[PDB]
Amino acid sequence: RELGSNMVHPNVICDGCNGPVVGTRYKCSVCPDYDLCSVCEGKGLHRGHTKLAFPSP
Ligand SMILES: [Zn+2]
Ligand SMILES: [Zn+2]
């Protein structure tokens, strides 16, 4: 796998773990305001809605 981005996405909070979103941001494409950090996405949270991957802010 290619070494991903590693920047903080400012003013984005992970709805999974309430942490910062560092690296890729996974924004749900169905929910109006739902995001996962790559750690929570990796854990399989919010499975059932397609998310969009934003590597960088
Ligand atoms: Zn998280
Ligand atoms: Zn959703």
Residue numbers in the entry: 115 to 171
Q: Could you pull the original sentences from the published paper?
A:
To gain insight into the molecular mechanism by which p62 recognizes Nt-R substrates, we determined the atomic-resolution structure of the p62ZZ-RE complex. An extensive network of salt bridges and hydrogen bonds stabilizes the p62ZZ-RE complex. The Nt-R is bound in a highly negatively charged groove lined with the residues D129, N132, D147, and D149 of p62. The complex is further stabilized through the interactions involving degron’s Glu2. The side chain carboxyl group of Glu2 forms a salt bridge with the guanidinium moiety of R139, which in turn is restrained through electrostatic and hydrogen bonding contacts with D149, whereas the backbone amide of Glu2 donates a hydrogen bond to the carboxyl group of D147.
Following binding to the ubiquitinated cargos, p62 undergoes oligomerization and delivers the cargo aggregates to the autophagosome via interacting with the autophagosomal membrane protein LC3.
